[PDB]
């Protein structure tokens with residue numbers, strides 16, 4: 501995409517801590533949340549959930565003709581319900597503006613006006629605080645890393661002149677087709693509007709890359725998941741390469757399921773939640789350690805702190821069936837996938853070594869708040885598949901009727917997540 505000139509681009513300031521020193525940074529809104537319009541005027545190129553057939557008769561003409569616009573200082577709060585102060589950032593779910601309504605948001609941490617911050621997580625401890633108290637069943641307030649390009653695509657894709665400054669270049673391990681710009685081009689060829697999301701559609705292209713989910717959670721359940729892909733960084737896909745939901749799920753270049761560590765799923769039902777060992781009713785500190793051996797990742801450990809207590813990660817609880825692993829390791833991934841009857845696509849795509857190499861190349865930090873139009877977040881917080889009674893189906897305490905976006909958007913529009921005190925530093929000892 502190119503950048504429009506209707507609205508000036510302002511990144512929202514955010515402070516964080518890197519190896520002992522305060523960094524005055526900012527966040528940027530993902531391009532998918534922006535207005536896409538003609539370069540000549542205010543006519544929408546993306547209108548509801550379809551592209552304008554006159555402006556965008558094919559992708560190349562669409563790309564020529566259409567621009568993504570800025571988000572100015574006032575737009576952050578007025579349109580997206582996003583606020584920041586100091587080291588704290590708050591995302592909102594439903595924000596009713598003047599003439600339209602926004603649902604959720606996705607933002608990236610900037611290094612400067614033109615480039616994302618790049619995190620090299622190997623042999624480091626990453627931590628932050630989160631308040632997930634105001635996220636019901638069905639919501640996901642997520643903090644995660646993806647193998648995006650630092651500049652958002654502008655060096656590799658000459659029709660992307662907007663770049664990281666306008667939140668371009670998202671990719672993740674789902675190879676999502678709902679991205680409006682991929683590889684610097686409008687993803688308008690083959691576009692089908694979604695049946696249940698009036699702002700969304702899908703195009704021919706997907707946007708694939710490695711993904712390290714540090715925190716996917718609401719007040720009822722939480723997980724952390726490594727997803728490795730067999731391709732190098734940001735990778736556009738078509739066809740079978742995208743590994744689309746359904747028959748193609750395991751046939752693409754990315755591990756969609758991931759090697760997931762979800763305490764409730766692993767048989768620790770009172771560990772996290774309302775009044776849990778980790779109490780989702782109050783702020784908590786999430787510490788994640790990327791442990792290496794011989795320079796390669798071999799373990800992703802989790803520690804929690806809350807009210808001055810240090811809380812070790814809850815171990816796998818299937819006595820006699822699976823060992824009491826308490827972290828993501830190769831053997832955990834293999835053993836738990838066997839017990840759950842899950843295809844081990846993590847190892848297929850490269851496994852821990854693969855992941856390691858992804859982390860070595862550096863990742864972008866993502867914070868988002870969304871609902872789930874595909875699976876109603878049931879994979880996180882309920883039972884999935886809904887009628888399944890075998891090991892690994894049970895995910896959280898929520899009803900299998902929970903999480904329909906039409907329901908949660910109506911019933912809990914005021915839901916929010918707050919992230920704060922982002923920090924990276926050396927791996928610390930926790931007694």
Ligand SMILES: OC[C@H]1O[C@@H](O[C@H]2[C@H](O)[C@@H](O)[C@H](O)O[C@@H]2CO)[C@H](O)[C@@H](O)[C@@H]1O
Nearest residue numbers: 674713716725756757758760879880884
């Ligand atoms: O894409 C949503 C979410 O999916 C997570 O993977 C699920 C997968 O969606 C489901 O079909 C399978 O049975 O379970 C895995 C693990 O719960 C993926 O793990 C997430 O990171 C992603 O946000």
Ligand SMILES: [Ca+2]
Nearest residue numbers: 539563564565
């Ligand atoms: Ca032209």
Ligand SMILES: [Ca+2]
Nearest residue numbers: 559689690704
């Ligand atoms: Ca074509």
Ligand SMILES: [Ca+2]
Nearest residue numbers: 739740741751
């Ligand atoms: Ca094929």
Ligand SMILES: [Ca+2]
Nearest residue numbers: 840891892893
């Ligand atoms: Ca299962």
